[PDB]
Design an enzyme around this catalytic site. Structure first.
Site, PDB file in Angstrom:
ATOM      1  CG  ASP A 258      -2.419  -0.552   0.706  1.00  0.00           C
ATOM      2  OD1 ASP A 258      -2.724  -0.620  -0.493  1.00  0.00           O
ATOM      3  OD2 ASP A 258      -3.151  -0.881   1.661  1.00  0.00           O
TER       4      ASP A 258
HETATM    5  O1  LIG Z   1       0.231   3.115   5.783  1.00  0.00           O
HETATM    6  C1  LIG Z   1      -0.974   3.024   5.486  1.00  0.00           C
HETATM    7  O2  LIG Z   1      -1.491   3.627   4.549  1.00  0.00           O
HETATM    8  C2  LIG Z   1      -1.813   2.090   6.252  1.00  0.00           C
HETATM    9  O3  LIG Z   1      -0.960   1.169   6.988  1.00  0.00           O
HETATM   10  C3  LIG Z   1      -2.598   1.198   5.253  1.00  0.00           C
HETATM   11  O4  LIG Z   1      -1.754   0.171   4.557  1.00  0.00           O
HETATM   12  C4  LIG Z   1      -3.725   0.589   6.105  1.00  0.00           C
HETATM   13  O5  LIG Z   1      -3.161  -0.220   7.188  1.00  0.00           O
HETATM   14  C5  LIG Z   1      -4.770  -0.190   5.262  1.00  0.00           C
HETATM   15  O6  LIG Z   1      -5.561   0.737   4.455  1.00  0.00           O
HETATM   16  C6  LIG Z   1      -5.721  -1.001   6.198  1.00  0.00           C
HETATM   17  O7  LIG Z   1      -6.390  -0.038   7.054  1.00  0.00           O
HETATM   18  O1  LIG Z   2      -2.859  -3.007   5.587  1.00  0.00           O
HETATM   19  C1  LIG Z   2      -2.711  -3.504   4.452  1.00  0.00           C
HETATM   20  O2  LIG Z   2      -1.408  -3.838   4.099  1.00  0.00           O
HETATM   21  C2  LIG Z   2      -1.130  -4.670   2.952  1.00  0.00           C
HETATM   22  C3  LIG Z   2       0.323  -4.342   2.631  1.00  0.00           C
HETATM   23  O3  LIG Z   2       0.415  -2.950   2.263  1.00  0.00           O
HETATM   24  C4  LIG Z   2      -2.157  -4.518   1.855  1.00  0.00           C
HETATM   25  O4  LIG Z   2      -1.866  -5.449   0.793  1.00  0.00           O
HETATM   26  C5  LIG Z   2      -3.594  -4.764   2.413  1.00  0.00           C
HETATM   27  O5  LIG Z   2      -4.587  -4.688   1.368  1.00  0.00           O
HETATM   28  C6  LIG Z   2      -3.882  -3.659   3.486  1.00  0.00           C
HETATM   29  O6  LIG Z   2      -5.031  -4.108   4.246  1.00  0.00           O
END
Ligand SMILES: O=C(O)[C@H](O)[C@@H](O)[C@H](O)[C@H](O)CO
Ligand SMILES: O=C1O[C@H](CO)[C@@H](O)[C@H](O)[C@H]1O
Ligand SMILES: O=C(O)[C@H](O)[C@@H](O)[C@H](O)[C@H](O)CO
Ligand SMILES: O=C1O[C@H](CO)[C@@H](O)[C@H](O)[C@H]1O
Ligand SMILES: [Cl-]
Ligand SMILES: [Cl-]
Lengths: 785, 785
Positions: free
Chosen positions: B472
């Site tokens: 992400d």
């Molecule tokens: O750094 C970030 O943007 C957050 O860690 C995301 O990866 C969330 O954890 C995800 O949207 C689940 O809520």
């Molecule tokens: O928190 C998260 O981390 C994961 C790694 O960034 C991503 O793949 C998942 O969809 C998200 O829920």
């Protein structure tokens, strides 16, 4: 106990439990800090937008302070633990977090510093905070003295909790090279544009020591262990563990071990604040962290506060009023105009009103503020909802919600400036607009403002309210495009009458006739549609309903339409006594006049969000001091001298002890409100918001200088027109005006019918001192019937 | 102590200080609550967007929980004070806020409830929390017993702090008619549109009693006084003061005064939660607040959890694995698919992966989830970043930042569904798109998804990464429009190979040839541009730089490109052993495999935000369990059985005591991560995030069912293909599959060369059980070399 000390430089509270919410504030060019008597503090700084370096233990919303801010055990603060190594016994300064029994306690609000003296276990502690003028850093001085006859072995531990800095990244460790603790985070975000935006953020927090300590601890949880803040585990053992924080909540704790001889005192210095990096922290250390650094900062800061000392020193039969006026009022005014509440987009009415206050402190700041504000005027003549102070700043929060009153302040506040300075030549300065190529004089900008207000009115001749006027949360009266404001109408008539006088003084007679006729037209529309028989209503909704009337159970009368109807001429001589009696019957309280009553207890959705605030808080029927001072100014304008003074004086807590305990504040500022809904909720009525940000103080200072003491400027010189309360047999004031000084003595005489004024012991005719030489001092004697 | 109790229904911790962060969770259709062993809790509910009823003591940011959530003394929680009226001595259950010495302590994580037993002062306390299925309300049962021989006079005080609800309006009082405390706020806002949006919010919080109390207190500050939470003033005096909260922080405190005989126990019931109004609170009281209400809720809740019990019960030589798998795993899977993490806009990869897990629990939910997800596919074939679960919901947070991997999950997870159910007929269902009028079969939607992935590739044949892929926060590799992803490439080849197999099974041969050739083309591009000699790189930046290579000091190897290169065929038989050894050397730890290493210690702005997280936390080099289980699944796919099992088993804490203390979690869930950066920061490595929301568990359950136990569906029936670790001489599993039950016994035999399978005691040929009748039970014996 609670009293002024040090020839008025400070104000001292001697109990840590009688007034537990009480606080004072400090500021500088880039930051402000509110400090609670027990050790809690809230600090914000500008970089150039607001930020903080000491955080809550959770993820907090983006915010400085709430009215009536609650504290809690882990709230940010500024603490020192003292441990007797012989007995294990501990206490903390200032009082939190341990809340031990103390032998002595003093909290000293200062004009230039905040300090405490405390004693427990025979050890005497002094703590002193101050700020420099220009940098973001807290200067802390700690003194520890063995007050007994035998030597004493002590551990001394600063505890400056940093809190939960960031979910993305937070840490901390000890830096020998910086000489103290450095906590580090990355401010959370998700959008790539925010990475570029955030590049210069000061995301480290330092706590630096002048004197090298025995040990340190940077892990909050390790510091507390099972003992908590009451009896930290790290303090129970002989030496701190020297732990770090690795994606753990960091803290700043040091340990000094000393054996102090009988009567021996030692001094320790620290600095606390934000930095981009360790090199910035070291730069601050080199600049500040020494006896010489602290002295130089303090001397420069004292000069800065003295530069804002204002223009009126009084000596009345009320020593509480003397203290407030002489020592605390001008400093609170000065804060507002000098740093504009530490926002990059001041609300336009705030920017203009706060700078109005500067007329009496540093009028060149006022002058520049008019030029800046008008440069952002729209081509239509309308003023924007906020004034941007920096390239790239944006309108935020309420400034994004369309309000309609922004132009009305321009002549209202310009009048104060012109009366004080005689700087009519400002009218000729050339300024652009927010868009387009037109560059026009101040005077032409003003004309366009007043034509805007005339055009922004419905078919009945009443001003549109959109999603609010002066009352920020009054957002559902006109949100559909038809609703109008009672207050804005009667204020617009005032503004137009004032500006027309100015135009006449400048030979712009066509302008004077146009704006005068506009005012008459508005006042006639007000009398036809807003007057409700015994007072003026507040507005008419989008669906044609008049509110703030005798038929409304809640919000039956609002203060503002009445004040401004007086000022702008909608209220004639027959209506005025109806106004006064309705205000006294429904709005006056022992803590001051409420802005509306009864307060709303549920949503009324053709008035709006105002009706959803807790009854008695803020705009929902508090003693909202800024509304109250508009009423005081209106009362002065019709010579209602006793009523004006009585209501002004209610804005200052004390000396009555029950009053002091109930308001809960030190008398070193006027808050934005004291809790209202006096009839509906008497237990909480009078409680201070503790919020020192308020446009009240520029008006209170104006009312005292021009109204009560009656030393008012005009194009001829100094007009002497006092409205002293009749209880005062004698009073004195020293007035600085146009570069000269006037030592004024007032006295009541049995033997005269009319006021008599003497200048340097000879009687003058008329009421104006017209020969004023810069640097001269004049003796004025004012004898009153 | 820490062990399973009650035939696996609960898991009990017997120290309140050894594992102070440990917690368990409960959920229902509309809410979830994380409860800490010491009494702190975080609760969120849907209305239909997230909200809470118990608040922090400050203004908190809009958030549920952080990884590694810290607590603090005023954090929300669920407490009961017990006072011996003879001595004045007090303690609190569960442990906070007083932290008294206890004679007994048990924290019981349950499948359907959370409970504690504690004892102090000779008084035995039981506390039990559960939720109903469908309503938002906490059901609380308190038992207090005099365990000694003489009568005892006690005061008992529930303390359910409500916190700082709102700056606009907050209050509370006692309601005799509701039978308990009602706290009330207005959720703050400024925009008129938000008034209309917020109309149905449940802005009251109730705390209702079955049994009328002696007294109550609703003012937090009055409750504490100078004594604080450690020794509240309200509890020091004989009776609570019965105060209210009027724009003051409210609280829920009651007082019961009892004289208990020797051995006498009394039971008290309460409900705690949100309501729109008092009439809703009373409705919940009537429904729930009784012995009969509680029983009926519990029986219905137990049925709900049993309905999600899953399809595999195991009996291996590892009793820790048996407990986890049998009791805790399927419940954690079930939470994810049944309520979709309590967001109205699940991230698309989450929605598809979590529902994949449901294939093994309630496959009709999976089926419906594919239909729902595909109905939101774009006309281009692209999948949106999130899936909206409600009319009017919007994409939020990361879902607003363009990521590119969303299509890849469709065939990857569909494969699990089709293998388990044989529901190829789902492919023929007709579904619309997000815009336009086209309505097409599932199969045609899938084709368009795979054509999307083929077209979203640069001139080298590699997939665009935009502002991220599965990782992400990997947002600066491709934000300028040229950067590509190593992981997305090799995953796309997997997805296309899988879907091509499906097309061949359905006689769609032109589709099978197109997607197979696409996979070859991608793999060839990967081998030419991403392979770095000993492992696959992670991506190529907008400026043409390959990262995740031996030339990078931080982020030298990422796990994901390696797993998915195995699965998708970029890694041939010569490359595979290089992958395995590089992963073992650089990424494996005692707590599991890290997702990247070494972790980033500073921003690398052609990779992005990932590099700014604390090293070892989350995507910056943690043991990120979901990445680890993709590697485990890849290892199973090439018969690396011992390595797969060893790494899977590392995801479960215990029984080693140092491991248990270091991870800090109860073994009743798999967290999203255990702290990584094992080489760089060994002190914190292994620490649990404590976050039960993770897509890991659907994959772990799949790997165990299909891979380790090897009981996998096909179009012919049940394929038996175990990869048991060689240490197990015997094991058993009971597998529910296509309506039948298989009692499988595995045993190692000296006397055979190849696996032998017997069905109901006769030897079969081949490895598929093909005659499966719904409701029947089959005995399977699997003899292994
Ligand atoms: O750094 C970030 O943007 C957050 O860690 C995301 O990866 C969330 O954890 C995800 O949207 C689940 O809520
Ligand atoms: O928190 C998260 O981390 C994961 C790694 O960034 C991503 O793949 C998942 O969809 C998200 O829920
Ligand atoms: O209810 C609100 O919208 C706030 O009270 C505003 O009136 C602010 O106090 C003002 O913007 C100064 O910050
Ligand atoms: O807080 C405020 O309240 C006032 C009343 O809403 C408004 O007039 C000021 O501009 C604003 O600062
Ligand atoms: Cl008003
Ligand atoms: Cl990755």
């Amino acid at each position: 106990g609670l009293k002024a000390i040090n020839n008025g430089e400070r104000y001292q509270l001697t109990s840590p439990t009688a007034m537990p919410q009480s606080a004072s504030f400090l500021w500088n060019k880039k930051m402000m800090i509110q400090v609670n008597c027990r050790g809690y503090a809230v600090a914000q700084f500008m970089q150039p937008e607001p930020a903080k370096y000491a955080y809550a233990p959770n993820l907090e919303a983006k915010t400085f302070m709430q009215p009536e801010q609650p504290y809690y055990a882990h709230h940010p603060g500024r603490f020192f633990y003292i441990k007797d190594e012989e007995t294990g016994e501990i206490f903390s300064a200032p009082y939190e977090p341990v809340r031990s029994q103390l032998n002595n306690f003093s909290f000293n609000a200062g004009k230039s510093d905040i300090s405490w003296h405390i004693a427990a276990l025979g050890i005497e502690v002094e703590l002193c905070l101050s700020l420099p003028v220009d940098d973001v850093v807290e200067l802390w001085e700690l003194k520890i003295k063995n007050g007994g006859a035998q030597p004493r072995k002590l551990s001394i531990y600063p505890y400056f909790p940093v809190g939960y800095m960031s979910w993305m990244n937070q840490s901390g460790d000890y830096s020998q090279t910086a000489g103290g603790i450095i906590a580090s985070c990355v401010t959370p975000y998700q959008k790539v544009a925010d990475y570029f935006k955030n590049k210069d953020f000061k995301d480290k927090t330092f706590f630096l020591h002048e004197t090298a300590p025995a040990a340190w601890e940077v892990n909050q949880k390790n510091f507390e262990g099972e003992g908590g803040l009451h009896n930290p585990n790290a303090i129970q053992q002989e030496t701190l563990g020297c732990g770090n924080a690795l994606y753990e909540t960091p803290t700043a704790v040091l340990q000094y071990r000393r054996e102090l001889a009988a009567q021996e005192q030692q001094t320790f210095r620290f600095i606390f604040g934000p930095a981009f990096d360790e090199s910035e922290a070291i730069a601050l250390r080199n600049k500040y962290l020494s006896a010489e650094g602290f002295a130089k900062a303090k001397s420069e800061y004292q000069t800065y506060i003295t530069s804002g000392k204002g223009c009126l020193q009084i000596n009345t039969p009320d020593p509480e009023l003397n203290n407030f006026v002489n020592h605390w009022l001008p400093r609170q005014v000065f804060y507002h105009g000098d740093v504009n509440r530490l926002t990059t987009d001041p609300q336009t009415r705030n920017y203009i009103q706060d700078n109005m206050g500067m007329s009496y402190i540093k009028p060149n700041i006022t002058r520049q503020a008019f030029l800046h504000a008008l440069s952002q005027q729209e081509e239509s003549g309308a003023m924007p909802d906020g004034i941007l102070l920096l390239e790239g700043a944006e309108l935020k929060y309420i400034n994004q919600i369309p309000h309609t009153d922004h132009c009305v302040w321009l002549p209202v506040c310009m009048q104060a400036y012109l009366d004080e300075t005689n700087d009519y030549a400002l009218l000729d300065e050339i300024v652009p607009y927010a868009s387009g190529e037109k560059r026009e004089t101040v005077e032409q900008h003003m004309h366009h403002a007043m034509r805007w207000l005339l055009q922004a009115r419905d078919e009945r001749g009443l001003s549109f309210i959109a999603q609010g006027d002066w009352c920020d949360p009054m957002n559902m009266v006109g949100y559909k495009g038809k609703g109008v404001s009672g207050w804005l109408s009667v204020a617009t008539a005032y503004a137009l009458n004032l500006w027309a006088d100015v135009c006449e003084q400048r030979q712009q007679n066509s302008c004077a006739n146009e704006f005068r006729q506009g005012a008459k037209d508005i006042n006639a529309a007000v009398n036809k549609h807003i007057w409700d028989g015994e007072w003026f209503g507040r507005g008419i909704t989008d669906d044609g309903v008049l509110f703030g009337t005798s038929k409304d159970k809640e919000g039956r009368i609002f203060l503002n339409p009445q004040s401004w109807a007086i000022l702008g001429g909608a209220a004639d001589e027959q209506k005025i006594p109806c106004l006064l009696d309705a205000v006294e019957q429904q709005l006056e309280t022992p803590y001051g006049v409420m802005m509306l009553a009864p307060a709303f207890t549920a949503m009324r959705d053709d008035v709006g969000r105002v009706t959803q605030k807790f009854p008695g808080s803020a705009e929902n029927g508090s003693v909202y001091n800024h509304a109250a001072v508009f009423y005081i100014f209106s009362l002065l304008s019709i010579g209602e001298s006793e009523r004006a003074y009585k209501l002004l004086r209610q804005m200052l807590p004390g000396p009555d002890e029950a009053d002091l305990l109930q308001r809960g504040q030190l008398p070193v500022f006027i808050p934005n409100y004291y809790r209202g809904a006096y009839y509906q909720h008497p237990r909480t009525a009078g409680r201070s918001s503790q919020l020192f940000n308020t446009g009240t103080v520029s008006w209170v200072y104006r009312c005292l200088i021009e109204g009560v003491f009656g030393l008012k400027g005009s194009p001829q010189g100094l007009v002497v027109q006092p409205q002293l309360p009749v209880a005062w047999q004698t009073a004195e004031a020293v007035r600085e005006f146009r570069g000269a000084t006037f030592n004024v003595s007032y006295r009541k005489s049995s033997d005269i019918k009319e006021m008599e004024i003497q200048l340097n012991e000879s009687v003058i005719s008329g009421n104006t001192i017209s020969d004023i030489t810069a640097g001269a001092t004049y003796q004025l004697t004012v004898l009153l019937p």
